[PDB]
């Protein structure tokens, strides 16, 4: 009744049936991981078993950690691969785009799942039913989780779509760091820096190939860090930088700044972006 | 240092002060009102000490309240005045821009200054603290306030202006519902429906006037009731709504939709509007 393919409940496919429907594609998992030695281990653990089996291929791609995260991704017995490794003759720009676009060039697989490091214990099944879609449908090319409070996804990307891309509207978490996409697709499309890499694959996504080439999937529940409000301040700006820029709207640049209390105030200027990775495919 | 004259301390100007400095100008003070039973009272009597000294006029704009708003008030001393009293050959439409803009014909001030009902236990000097700049300085037309989380403002409007407006990056809180205007720019202007109202008033002030037009005031601390986050979710698609449309950007006119968790999800809509109220100079 959602005119884009929606799966409401837990999802009925068994991962033998999942893996007959392969057909000889293979599927590659990426968690990319900045600073989070606390979580990861769990991640990896989540989805370790699948591997040799639905899963071909698991990879962290860290992003600068300084704490742990690369040794106890190590000890859980993932293939740790750094922003440089991935792609050693560019010099690494900072943001999460950065990282989920060089992770394209350190896999292979004809599908790819992206999940994100500081989930608190996830559901084993989260890869599983992210691929359902793209593996028993035909022409999904892109899938988004959605679950069970998302301020800056309520309040600033939702209104947003439904201001300039209403047909949009009926996606329920646009910017979840939980989806899996065909390499065809994430290799011809450009990625957004920082935070603003998932509102830009979706946006292009649809703008290319409409609402019948993306579905969206109920993972239940899902938990992870609650950033402070100053830092949501500066990824609401960077989404909204890359939502104006697919919307054919001017961005000024400039990016916001913050007065804290300290009554006496102080002044911080956050960066924000308006450059884009290009399609993977130029690097071939 | 910013380029927006801001008052970063409290204010030095007595009582007296301001009223010498009044030369003949009036002052008008309106609270709006819908459903407010619990802190209309406080608001009122923080400011009726000034009625027939500084502040010249006094009115409770009520918004088709169903609660004790209304008797509350009158036992306060506060004339109250219905949207249909202020102007009753026209049919009231929903929303606070309405009742603001309604408030401009059954008050009579050279100078308006809003207050909202909603503020718990508010300082008496908020209202001279306000005026300060209109009465004292030369070319201002518009006080905004500040104050020590702004949800909506953090992560919506100050964002969005950085992006599409960045010249009134300096404004600490572009939504405050507490702020001081000329009767002269007020009637001039139109009004943004729903809560639109405020972004409107402050975009139209700076096309039209620039920053020299604008002061802001540092009004200490400022507490009032914090509305779920659905409701905020409609709040933001209407601020959206006006701050594209005074940016010359077509925003699509659907309404935000939210999918609520009974899993099981049901379907709201929220009402979002396009139409203004134009400048109250048209209706004499
Ligand atoms: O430059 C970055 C920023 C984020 N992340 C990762 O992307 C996900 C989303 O980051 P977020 O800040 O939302 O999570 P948090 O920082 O609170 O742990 C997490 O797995 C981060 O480790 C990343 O790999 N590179
Ligand atoms: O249609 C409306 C909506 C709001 N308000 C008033 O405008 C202020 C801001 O409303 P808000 O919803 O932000 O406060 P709350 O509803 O939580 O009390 C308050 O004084 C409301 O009573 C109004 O007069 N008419
Ligand atoms: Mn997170
Ligand atoms: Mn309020």
């Known amino acids: 009744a959602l005119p884009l393919d929606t799966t409401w409940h ?26 989070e030695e606390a979580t990861i281990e769990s991640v990896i653990d989540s989805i370790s078993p699948l591997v040799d089996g639905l899963v071909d291929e698991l990879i962290v791609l860290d ?12 000890a859980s017995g ?4 750094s922003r440089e490794q991935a792609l050693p003759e560019v010099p690494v720009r900072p943001g999460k785009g950065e990282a989920l676009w060089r992770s394209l060039a350190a896999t292979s697989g004809d599908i790819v799942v992206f999940i994100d490091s500081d989930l608190i214990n996830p559901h084993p099944l989260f890869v599983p039913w992210l691929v359902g879609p793209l593996l028993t449908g ?14 800056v996804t309520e309040l600033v990307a939702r209104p947003l779509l439904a201001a300039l891309r209403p047909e949009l509207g009926c996606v329920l ?9 065909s390499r065809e697709l994430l290799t011809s499309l450009p ?11 979706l946006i292009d996504t649809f ?53 804290l209390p300290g009554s ?21």
């Open 264 to 284: 006496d105030y102080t002044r911080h200027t956050w960066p924000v972006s308006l450059v884009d990775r290009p399609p993977m495919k130029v690097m071939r």
């Open 10 to 35: 837990r999802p009925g496919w068994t991962i033998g049936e999942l893996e007959a429907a392969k057909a000889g594609r293979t599927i590659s998992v990426v968690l990319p991981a900045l600073n």
């Open 191 to 201: 990625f957004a820096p920082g935070y603003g890499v998932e509102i830009g694959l």
């Open 78 to 81: 993932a293939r740790v691969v």
């Open 63 to 74: 992003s600068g950690s300084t704490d742990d995260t690369e040794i106890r991704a190590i």
């Open 207 to 259: 703008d290319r190939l409409g609402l019948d080439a993306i579905a969206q999937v109920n993972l239940g529940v899902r938990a992870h860090r609650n950033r402070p409000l100053d830092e949501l301040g500066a990824m609401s700006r960077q989404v909204i930088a890359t939502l104006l820029s697919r919307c054919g709207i001017p961005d000024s640049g400039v990016g916001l700044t913050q007065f």
């Open 173 to 181: 978490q646009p910017l979840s760091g939980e989806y899996a996409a």
């Open 138 to 151: 035909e022409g999904i090319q892109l899938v988004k989780s959605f679950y069970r409070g998302g301020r």
